[PDB]
Amino acid sequence: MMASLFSVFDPTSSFLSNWLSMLIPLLFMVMSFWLIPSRPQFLAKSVLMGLNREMSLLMGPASFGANILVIALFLFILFNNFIGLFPYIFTATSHLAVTLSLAVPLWISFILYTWIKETTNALAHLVPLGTPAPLMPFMVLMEIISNMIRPITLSVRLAANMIAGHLLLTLLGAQGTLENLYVTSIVVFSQIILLMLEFSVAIIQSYVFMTLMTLYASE
Amino acid sequence: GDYPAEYNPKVHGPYDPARFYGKADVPLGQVKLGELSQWLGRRNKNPQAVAAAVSRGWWRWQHKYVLPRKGGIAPYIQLIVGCSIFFYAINYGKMVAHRQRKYH
Amino acid sequence: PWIMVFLVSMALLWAIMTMVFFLYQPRSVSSAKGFSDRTVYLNWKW
Amino acid sequence: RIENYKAELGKLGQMIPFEHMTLEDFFEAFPEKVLNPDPPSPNVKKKPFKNN
Amino acid sequence: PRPLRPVNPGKVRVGFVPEEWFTFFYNKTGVTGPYVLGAGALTFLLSKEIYVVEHEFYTGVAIAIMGTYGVKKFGKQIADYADKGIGEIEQSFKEYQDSSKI
Amino acid sequence: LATFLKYAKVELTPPGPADVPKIQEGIQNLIHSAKTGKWKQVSVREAWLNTLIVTEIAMWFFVGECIGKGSVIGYR
């Protein structure tokens, strides 16, 4: 009930810029040496092989070997949401260029490959199936607008979750005092509930974006 | 991106990215600080050399905390605190601009 | 500097993709069971 | 063929055990390997390529 | 030198700090040495405003409490699950070698 | 944490006030070293150990500084 603060998204606060905040997931990659794997390698391998099995129902021939790109997109999203919630790290996903890289090049990849391969089916995706003549043209124009700006909202969605998540945490932290045990315990317990929500949504947001890209690479 | 040319599989054996495969140099731990200037000037400061020195150190840390069979959560907690400490010093300019005590 | 941020993110995505590609467990599950089915036997001069 | 089987058993006798074996030595002892002109797969396995 | 895989990783106290750091001070300032320096350093950074106690500190506490509770509750199950998969791989590889010899 | 309290009794006692010749003689031995040597021949690993020993000693000055102002959480 005291105050608030913002602006945790400055890339050049120091001469060692915040581009190193994107080079942090390279550390967490499980580099493998031995034949029999270690504990975290087997955990990571079991998770990824689990996701590959689940996505195998939705792969299709046009994404015959593009599942590596989808899984790499999943791990990149997860390590840019999980690492964005740790305290003294600037919110990388808040910067739109990360979200620009997330949605725009892959959407252009999928829409141009669809247009070159199946041009009539791509235009038929802009119409609801079995649409009569008087119901045709307004559905076509709106779905043209829909399919043009749908990945832009995907980029907004990935940004907005971590922006709203980090704004909520900074709000709860700034409205607490160290000296007051009652306020500190309330603030800490409120953030723990909020972090459990924010950790859960971050994993689920990465899971749905893998599912959406697997569906849209199948076609 | 290849195995370093100083590596010999016949003498050393299989490759190990945590072992320095050049000439066996005396490490800085046993330098009596009278050879400190000589030791620092002898080791080259190429971008290639420091990048290889980082990877040889990183794989040494993997060999001590992850690559053993019963690797616990301790490496992954050390990295988080290590990155948080390093990124707090980077964002020190924004943090110290607010502070808490007017005099301290 | 959106261009530099985009390039780093894409280069990271390529580096994560390569790390995933080699992240696997090779297995050797080809025993000598087929060798036991190759019993070469002489035709008898009846 | 007996000498071939004896040579194969000699290879298995001289093979280092799979417990303390580096991944490069597993690729060296079993030359099936993987490289650039190799069948790609999300998990490079024995038969992940055709499956049709 | 043939690289031999160790069974247990390096010794670690207080969750993440290396034990090689703590034993480095034993010959001069004993066991209490590293803890004294750590307590003094934490006091110095808080007192001289080097460690800014801002809103993110409470998030840092909340992560630390959640991480300790989550690891202590599920660490044994996950490590046993991973060790189960390693044992199945080890059993698979040793059975392949025995079947090939037979 | 009784053993932590036990070790605190063993090796956090105030130093012997009778050691005043025995600490200045060591200081004078270090002064004898200071213009002559005993630091250009000490291993960097042990030299880094010696510097952190001084760092451990110098931290008590800031601990005493927090005591002299009362509360240790900044200036109250």
Is the CB of residue A93 less than 8 Å from the CB of residue A81? yes
- Sorted by sequence, the CB contacts under 8 Å of residue A69 that are 6+ apart come out as A106, C17
Contact residues on chain D for C28, CB-CB shorter than 8 A: 30
Of D12, D18, D22, the CB nearest to E93: D18
Closest residue in C to E89 (Cα–Cα): C27
- Quick check: C27 contacting D, CB < 8 Å? yes
Experimental method: cryo-EM
Is the CB of residue C27 less than 8 Å from the CB of residue D46? yes
DSSP state of E12: E
Q: How many other CB atoms are there within 10 angstroms of residue F35's CB atom?
A: 6
Q: What 3-state DSSP class applies to F32?
A: helix
Of E28, E41, E46, the CB nearest to F49: E28
In units of Å, what resolution does this entry have?
Answer: 2.6
Contact residues on chain A for D22, CB-CB shorter than 8 A: 33-35
Chain F touching partners, 3 or more CB pairs below 8 A:
B, E
- Sorted by sequence, the CB contacts under 8 Å of residue B86 that are 6+ apart come out as none
Is the CB of residue A44 less than 8 Å from the CB of residue C24? no
Dihedral, CA of residue A124, residue A128, residue A129 and residue A135, to nearest 10: -110
Of B80, B91, B94, the CB nearest to A86: B80
Closest residue in B to F48 (Cα–Cα): B29
- Quick check: F52 contacting E, CB < 8 Å? yes
Contact residues on chain F for B30, CB-CB shorter than 8 A: 43-45
Size of interface A-E (CB pairs under 8 A): 68
Q: After which residues is chain E broken (C to N over 2.5 A)?
A: none
Measure CA of the first residue to CA of the last residue in chain E; give whole Å: 33
